Design a binder for this molecule. Structure first.
Ligand code: CL
Ligand code: CL
Length: 162
């Protein structure tokens, strides 16, 4: 199992513009287009990301291509973050994956927010972290996804996703 297959599971794959759990215009494998309410704003951003006149519809390959960039960007965004980086370097491979997932979902910023959870992960206090991670709007809005991610942090294995 790796980050890609993990995020593909959590994010899905949709070839036509859609609105995410949050109501955001999305496409492909969890690619957020805009938080704007405008559909047009959406298709514009899409056209811009793809480099062609889409009419809100993309190919498989195109989704996978936005997918690689966005995983790249999430990683980059961890290794660039004074707060994240230390946690990520402290962790084992599986748990690095779980961190990336969160960062792909919620943004670097979003995650850098979890001060206490982070310190917890850094310390390798798995059970505690998991209960702190759980007291969050993230958990209460996307509980099954969240549970997947927290289990992964707890266990350091891919069970949740098998
Ligand atoms: Cl882009
Ligand atoms: Cl969920």
């Amino acid at each position: 199992m790796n980050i890609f297959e993990m995020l593909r599971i959590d994010e899905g794959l949709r070839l036509k513009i859609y609105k995410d759990t949050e109501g955001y215009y999305t496409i492909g494998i969890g690619h957020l287009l805009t938080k704007s309410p405008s559909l047009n704003a959406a298709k514009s951003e899409l056209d811009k990301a793809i480099g062609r006149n889409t009419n809100g519809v993309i190919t498989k390959d195109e989704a996978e291509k936005l997918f690689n960039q966005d995983v790249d960007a999430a990683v980059r965004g961890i290794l660039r973050n004074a707060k994240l980086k230390p946690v990520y370097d402290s962790a084992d491979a599986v748990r690095r994956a779980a961190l990336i997932n969160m960062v792909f979902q919620m943004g670097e910023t979003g995650v850098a927010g979890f001060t206490n959870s982070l310190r917890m992960l850094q310390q390798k206090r798995w059970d505690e972290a998991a209960v702190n991670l759980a007291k969050s709007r993230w958990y209460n809005q996307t509980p099954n996804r969240a549970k997947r991610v927290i289990t992964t942090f707890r266990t350091g294995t891919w069970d949740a996703y098998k």
